[PDB]
Design an enzyme around this catalytic site. Structure first.
Site, PDB file in Angstrom:
ATOM      1  N   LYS D 154      61.821  56.026  31.460  1.00 19.41           N
ATOM      2  CA  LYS D 154      62.161  55.225  32.628  1.00 19.41           C
ATOM      3  C   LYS D 154      61.090  54.200  32.989  1.00 19.41           C
ATOM      4  O   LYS D 154      61.392  53.028  33.211  1.00 19.41           O
ATOM      5  CB  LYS D 154      62.429  56.140  33.819  1.00 19.41           C
ATOM      6  CG  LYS D 154      63.524  55.654  34.727  1.00 19.41           C
ATOM      7  CD  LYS D 154      64.195  56.823  35.408  1.00 19.41           C
ATOM      8  CE  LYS D 154      65.267  56.338  36.352  1.00 19.41           C
ATOM      9  NZ  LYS D 154      64.672  55.517  37.438  1.00 19.41           N
ATOM     10  N   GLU D 180      55.926  57.054  42.716  1.00 19.69           N
ATOM     11  CA  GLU D 180      55.552  57.181  41.310  1.00 19.69           C
ATOM     12  C   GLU D 180      54.245  57.947  41.110  1.00 19.69           C
ATOM     13  O   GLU D 180      53.613  58.385  42.072  1.00 19.69           O
ATOM     14  CB  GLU D 180      55.462  55.802  40.649  1.00 19.69           C
ATOM     15  CG  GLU D 180      55.059  54.678  41.596  1.00 19.69           C
ATOM     16  CD  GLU D 180      53.647  54.831  42.127  1.00 19.69           C
ATOM     17  OE1 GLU D 180      52.696  54.742  41.322  1.00 19.69           O
ATOM     18  OE2 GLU D 180      53.487  55.046  43.348  1.00 19.69           O
ATOM     19  N   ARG D 181      53.863  58.115  39.846  1.00 19.20           N
ATOM     20  CA  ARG D 181      52.577  58.697  39.486  1.00 19.20           C
ATOM     21  C   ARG D 181      51.485  57.691  39.820  1.00 19.20           C
ATOM     22  O   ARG D 181      51.670  56.493  39.619  1.00 19.20           O
ATOM     23  CB  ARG D 181      52.537  58.987  37.986  1.00 19.20           C
ATOM     24  CG  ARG D 181      53.803  59.617  37.430  1.00 19.20           C
ATOM     25  CD  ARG D 181      53.869  59.468  35.914  1.00 19.20           C
ATOM     26  NE  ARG D 181      54.894  60.324  35.320  1.00 19.20           N
ATOM     27  CZ  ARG D 181      56.139  59.936  35.058  1.00 19.20           C
ATOM     28  NH1 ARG D 181      56.524  58.698  35.333  1.00 19.20           N
ATOM     29  NH2 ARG D 181      57.000  60.788  34.519  1.00 19.20           N
TER      30      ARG D 181
END
Ligand SMILES: Nc1ncnc2c1ncn2[C@@H]1O[C@H](COP(=O)(O)OP(=O)(O)NP(=O)(O)O)[C@@H](O)[C@H]1O
Ligand SMILES: Nc1ncnc2c1ncn2[C@@H]1O[C@H](COP(=O)(O)OP(=O)(O)O)[C@@H](O)[C@H]1O
Ligand SMILES: [Mg+2]
Ligand SMILES: [Mg+2]
Lengths: 487, 458, 55, 458, 128
Positions: D154, D180-181
């Site tokens: 993704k 997100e990360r």
């Protein structure tokens, strides 16, 4: 009893008001600023209302006046070329509202004895729909299918084919994206259909009350034409998005949820909205002021649009709408992705009006396709094992493949009831049986279609009269025999 | 003598002086300016308070309004005064004609007839449609279910059952349009007046757009009418238009009434609701009320609770088929799946049970033969087999027929066929005398007597 | 040559048919899983919407 | 000005007595264990109390401490001054340079542009990706969405889009990672600072590590920047990681905000929460916005509400399935369930269209044959269908191609395919030109002339 | 650090969540179950020289610390597309699928290639 009230709480476009003892159900309620709310939930010692617009500015204590009547809206012949709000506010650009009179959004549908039996056709343009899922004035066909099966394309294409038939059109965009809607009307303009259709709009950002009311507003606008001996065609795009909005309201108002957390009265919602659409007997001459003759009949055809998730046609909302509409066109995602563009699936689709809502010649020559298609339905299983079967049933399979390869058109290319020639005498003889192979079985279509514009006086004739007996058949027989001396 | 306290959708609730307060299922009148709409008490919750459902639109209503406590439950005109025209959930005429001639004015509410009623009762009501009589014999006090999806012909088939039983016999017909479509309600009324049939047929409509509480009771109303005709000692029929919309409408009521959902979200009382509606429909010692009801199947799934709880009550089941209809046969019933708890020999005579099973048998064998006929062609069947297939092909079309109420569609003249003509027809056509005439002779005709005629024109 | 090829057919058939019977059996095992998943999802949602709906 | 009354996770409500009841969307601060803590008013609850959401760890808040109310909705800088570096959801400089920043300032809560003020074009931009360019193109002023379960590439997909169109850009970009990360963001910053391309981009980071409040608001603080850049300079790019993380945040809260749960436990306001934010991104008359965004799909369910409703708001919708990844095709796009609103013949020319739908068809025809193959083997297909699957399986793995950004964890060096070549190849394979070549010849290569050369080696 | 069975944690949290009456979502898990694992695994990371200096107060004066973390998720019948497993995959920057049937057939480090990945990839390995 008291006329005024004050805001106790305000959250998520919903207001809970104290006092306001004198207040009716569904009654308008003017807030500070210009915007109103809707009294949908009058409990004791508190009345919850849905803000019809932004709700950020509102606050505690604000004086809230009760008002007279319910939600009304601009209706008339003037709206045609315009794109309008849910309230009838022209976001179009022209600016002024050339409107004639007002009318309630929520209002009862004409009872029995006021109805006339539907029997005149509304051409969608598609060979597929007009021949086996016919539609007619005063009817309600439910266009339903998964995402991206070509629902809207079918809808506005049916609208575009009324650019010349005399029926006025309405397009109620609900929960849609603004960027998309402009795109649509932009194409309603590329073809002459926009000057003939009012487009109501409730973008994805507008209040829950605005989306939930959008269909009803666009209805009262269309009802105008029917009540005065004229025909109209409204199409509620995304009736699914409407119910999800009304679900948002009923949940915020703390009402008991049924299946899928939807309000118990969801069926009732769509029920009264759709019974609104119908054909009404000429004796509706008694109107707002009986009655400028008015020897004519009037009607309001409405094809709603449900969106199913993963083909789940037994879900709550779909189950309701399918049960209501007197007919529904199922669009399959499998037929679509394959190549069968009007992804209509016969056998599962239905039109309880049928032959009535169809021209005379169509009624006759469509009978051959209905059964030819139905037999191909039975042998479809052997298609994998084709060549295992003797020629007897093998030929029926080929006829079926071709006849379904025939019922598929490009998007913006409505057919002339000369589609009659094509469809009809595809069935009469295997003029497709020669030279079948399906690759050519379509390029022949666009070739028979234009060599008739060669000698089309005998064609616009069949077009206007909308009838056939035998001479015309005889002529038709020869037109194809004469055909294969070309290409 | 009371005032509206809260109002949500069709769920208006009213307060009263304690003692006196309305019994459950009691009627309530109330003005909202334009007209007076009725309320039906549903729950006697708390002290003095009462939850009810608006029989009409609850719009315009406001807190503190005067609600007049009526005495009895719903009131409805019964007797022959009703036969002759339409009328909504609660008696009042909608046909713009005169007012109901007279009424003892019965309540729509019920009581199960004690199991003192005259079964044994085999009177094998002749419809008489060939296939619906040959394959589905049903007796008085019995209830027949018409199964199928949309467009199969449940409603139109009912129209025919009404016209035939009306003019070929004694009318005796009550039509309860539970949540019925308006367009259907019109074409029905018109088609019924076109033919002499309209009397006896007392119509009771509950348009789709009417509130749930309204559409729920529409069944009991039309039921109560035929419920009195049996009291007069006559054998009346009762056509409920949609058993599905009955249970489904009953679902909405339970929903906004706050009850906990159950199977698939249906009301936690679905069984009992269907129970009382179905149980008063029987053959009493004095008279009888027979019923044929359209059972719509959602997603063509017989496990759905709606058609599920219906099955327990049907004496016979006539399954129609969307695909049979497509192929041209318009009494579109599947002879192989249509059943009748009454189709045994000692009930309907041997001749009937034999030719019945025979048609079933031959239709079946053709199905088996059909497989080899595609794969290795017709030439493979033995002379006896390709004789079975020709003979079967014929009986297939024979059990189709032009309905009288169908002329608005096809134009051909409809035809009524007896039970004895039918048996006399099918028995012979498979024994089989009429082998010398082409299939088309049997396509759309009365007894084979007509088929042989058409065969001459051929 | 024909009569022998025919005896080869009956064998190759009954052999290749045992394969088809075993292929079907494997699909039935995979399907039984996909089913049991939906069986659970269905029963959790029906239970959850009822209880959360009541509230 | 006021005091705490309750504290439940991110939701804290404050009593403020009448004089100054905070406007619905409005900020206000609180002194906790050490530092400033901004709450955002969400609901004017009755009685002079008010619901808010902690824009930071709600841990360590006493039940009674004072809170000051300001009149500013949310303080976020906008303009060229922001281009430099990373920002907070609060508009604070999260990086290590005390921001020079704003010549102006906007609220994160804004209205969607006026209808007649909306523009649109058809100038298609070209991504490097073969799948995307062929199967679903978009003009600048478009809304692209990348749907996919966990671990379907993704992120790496968005980053490759970025590196491809952020070059042809020659304009102002606005990345806005949300939920997100953090590890990716750090790399994206450092990676982009070495390429020196930061001076035309503008960062804003609400991590999946940060509390709920930051997440459902950081998406807004993100585009309110792109909006400023829009209402002046014309062409801006807007990249957003996981719009889902924003909706998901709103769900963790919906319970405490005290509203009943919708379907599958989601908020009843899902329809609007999405639409508000999603309707903001658009091409104005004054300036357009090109935007791709990674919309997560929970548990692979494309029927799950988040994805289901998100669909309507996208111009082009490319979807990545785990099944296609499980093979080895790592632009894991499902070429069937993935589409664009602009795959129109009048827009993308006939050659592109016919090629796209041709490729689509044979690939779908293959999915149908897939069943009989698995049960009865390949040798049961006609010589024609046999060729269908063979040609399809070539297409199926010509869709694949190594991404530059993906070199790190896979030996395969990247490649970039012309929208021109993408047509040449697929059109080509479908015609039956490159048949002789084995399948592996097509797997993981650039132009068709690479498939050819790979066939030589093996 | 290696968190043994984050699956057993999530199920424990779901217990408390439902006892507190919090509205369940997919598979009856509270909507914040992602945040549960997210803020935990986000802890694991590499801190650059400046951060270590600021925290250490100038004692370390030039070094980078790190918390490498590999959690464990127990799937049912290889259903990798389940709710909790999908979330933890969405969080972690890589994964290692131990196949059930590869394991039965002696291949003990049952790691399934072509599906297992390490997105950090090349950098994570030595030169040789
Ligand atoms: N008869 C047709 N021939 C060729 N293309 C078609 C045809 N009908 C529809 N399409 C295409 O199908 C795509 C989608 O059609 P559309 O009518 O938007 O489906 P829809 O179900 O309303 N999808 P959506 O409303 O966004 O969920 C469009 O790109 C159309 O151009
Ligand atoms: N004898 C017939 N000839 C032609 N059409 C018929 C005949 N009988 C039924 N139909 C068709 O059945 C359609 C719908 O009838 P209806 O019974 O209301 O369907 P449903 O039972 O699903 O409600 C009509 O459009 C009508 O054309
Ligand atoms: Mg659409
Ligand atoms: Mg009907």
């Amino acid at each position: 009893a008291h006329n005024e009230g004050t805001i106790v709480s305000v959250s998520d476009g919903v207001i809970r008001i104290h006092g306001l003892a004198d207040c009716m159900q569904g009654e308008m309620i003017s807030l500070p600023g210009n915007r109103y709310a809707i009294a949908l939930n009058l409990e004791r010692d508190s009345v919850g209302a849905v803000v019809m617009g932004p709700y950020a500015d509102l606050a505690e204590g604000m004086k809230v006046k009760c008002t007279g009547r319910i939600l009304e809206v601009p209706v008339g012949r003037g709206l045609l070329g315009r794109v309008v709000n849910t309230l009838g506010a022209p976001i179009d650009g022209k600016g002024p509202l050339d409107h004639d009179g007002f009318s309630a959004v929520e209002a009862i549908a004409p009872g029995v004895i006021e109805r006339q039996s539907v029997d005149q056709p509304v051409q969608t343009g598609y060979k597929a729909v007009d021949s086996m899922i016919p539609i007619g004035r005063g009817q309600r066909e439910l266009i339903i299918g998964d995402r991206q099966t070509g629902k809207t394309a079918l809808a506005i294409d049916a609208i575009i084919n009324q650019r010349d038939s005399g029926i006025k059109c309405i397009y109620v965009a609900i929960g849609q994206k603004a960027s998309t809607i402009s795109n649509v009307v932009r194409k309603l303009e590329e073809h002459g259909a926009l000057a003939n259709t009012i487009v109501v709009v409730a973008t994805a950002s507008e209040s829950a009350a605005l989306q939930y009311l959008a269909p009803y507003a666009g209805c009262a606008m269309g009802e105008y034409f029917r009540d005065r001996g004229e025909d109209a065609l409204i199409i509620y795009d995304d009736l699914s998005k409407q119910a999800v909005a009304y679900r948002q309201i009923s949940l915020l108002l703390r009402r008991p949820p049924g299946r899928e957390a939807f309000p118990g009265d969801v069926f009732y919602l769509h029920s009264r909205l759709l019974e609104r659409a119908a054909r009404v007997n000429a004796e509706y001459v008694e109107a707002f002021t009986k009655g400028e003759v008015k020897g004519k009949t009037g009607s309001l055809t409405a094809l709603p649009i449900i969106e199913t998730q993963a083909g789940d046609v037994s879900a709550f909302v779909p189950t309701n709408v399918i049960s209501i509409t007197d007919g529904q066109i199922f669009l399959e995602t499998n037929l679509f992705n394959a190549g069968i563009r009007p992804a209509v699936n016969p056998g599962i689709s239905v039109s309880r009006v049928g032959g009535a809502a169809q021209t005379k010649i169509m009624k006759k020559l469509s009978g051959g396709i209905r059964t030819a298609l139905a037999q191909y339905r039975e042998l479809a299983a052997f298609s994998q094992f084709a060549s295992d079967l003797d020629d007897a049933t093998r030929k029926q399979l080929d006829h079926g493949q071709k006849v379904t390869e025939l019922l598929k058109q490009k998007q913006y290319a409505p057919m002339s009831v000369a589609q009659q020639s094509l469809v009809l005498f595809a069935a009469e003889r295997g003029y497709l049986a020669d030279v079948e192979l399906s690759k050519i079985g379509s390029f022949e279509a666009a070739l028979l279609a234009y060599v008739d514009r060669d000698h089309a006086p005998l064609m616009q004739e069949i077009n206007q009269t909308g009838g056939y007996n035998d001479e015309i058949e005889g002529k038709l027989k020869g037109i194809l025999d004469s055909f294969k001396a070309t290409q | 003598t009371g005032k509206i306290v809260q109002v949500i959708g069709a769920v208006v609730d009213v307060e009263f002086p304690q003692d006196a307060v309305p019994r459950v299922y009691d009627a309530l009148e109330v003005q909202n300016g334009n007209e007076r709409l009725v309320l039906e008490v549903q729950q006697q919750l708390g002290g003095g308070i009462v939850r009810t459902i608006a029989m009409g639109s609850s719009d315009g209503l406001r807190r503190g309004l005067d609600v007049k406590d009526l005495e009895h439950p719903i009131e409805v005109p019964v007797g022959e005064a009703t036969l002759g025209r339409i009328m909504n959930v609660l008696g009042e005429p909608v046909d713009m004609k005169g007012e109901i001639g007279e009424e003892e004015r019965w309540a729509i509410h019920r009581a199960a007839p004690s199991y003192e009623e005259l079964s044994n009762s085999q009177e094998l009501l002749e419809t008489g449609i060939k296939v619906i009589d040959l394959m589905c014999p049903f007796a008085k006090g019995g209830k027949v279910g018409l199964f199928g999806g949309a467009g199969v012909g449940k409603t139109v088939n009912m129209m025919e059952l009404i016209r035939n039983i009306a003019i070929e016999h004694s009318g005796y017909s009550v039509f309860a349009g539970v949540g019925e479509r308006t367009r259907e309600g019109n074409d029905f009324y018109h088609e019924m007046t076109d033919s002499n049939v309209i009397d006896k047929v007392s119509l009771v409509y509950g348009q789709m757009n009417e509130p749930p509480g309204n559409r729920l009771r529409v069944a009991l109303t039309g039921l109560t009418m035929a419920e009195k005709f049996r009291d007069e000692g006559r054998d009346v029929l009762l056509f409920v238009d949609n058993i599905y919309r009955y249970t489904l409408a009953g679902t909405e009521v339970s929903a906004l009434l706050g009850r906990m959902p159950s199977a698939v979200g249906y009301q936690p009382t679905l069984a009992e609701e269907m129970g009382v509606l179905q149980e008063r429909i029987t053959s009493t010692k004095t008279g009888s009320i027979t019923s044929v009801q359209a059972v719509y199947v959602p997603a063509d799934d017989l496990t759905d609770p709606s058609p599920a709880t219906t099955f327990a009550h049907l004496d016979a089941t006539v399954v129609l088929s969307r695909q049979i209809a497509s192929l041209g046969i318009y009494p579109a019933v599947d002879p192989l799946d249509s059943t009748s708890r009454q189709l045994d020999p000692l009930v309907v005579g041997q001749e009937h049970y034999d030719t019945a099973r025979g048609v079933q048998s031959i239709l079946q064998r053709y199905q088996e033969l059909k497989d080899i006929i595609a794969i290795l062609g017709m030439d493979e069947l033995s002379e006896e087999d390709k004789l079975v297939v020709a003979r079967a092909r014929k009986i297939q079309r024979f059990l189709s027929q032009p309905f009288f109420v169908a002329e608005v569609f096809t134009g051909s003249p409809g035809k009524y066929v007896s039970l004895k003509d039918t048996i006399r027809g099918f028995k012979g056509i498979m024994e089989g005398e009429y082998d010398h005439l082409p299939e088309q002779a049997f396509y759309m005709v009365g007894s084979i007597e007509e088929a042989v005629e058409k065969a001459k024109k051929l | 040559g024909v009569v022998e090829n025919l005896a080869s057919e009956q064998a190759a058939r009954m052999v290749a048919m045992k394969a088809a019977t075993d292929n079907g059996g494997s699909l039935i095992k995979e399907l039984q899983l996909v089913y049991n998943k939906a069986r659970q999802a269905s029963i959790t949602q029906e239970l959850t919407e009822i209880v959360s709906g009541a509230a």
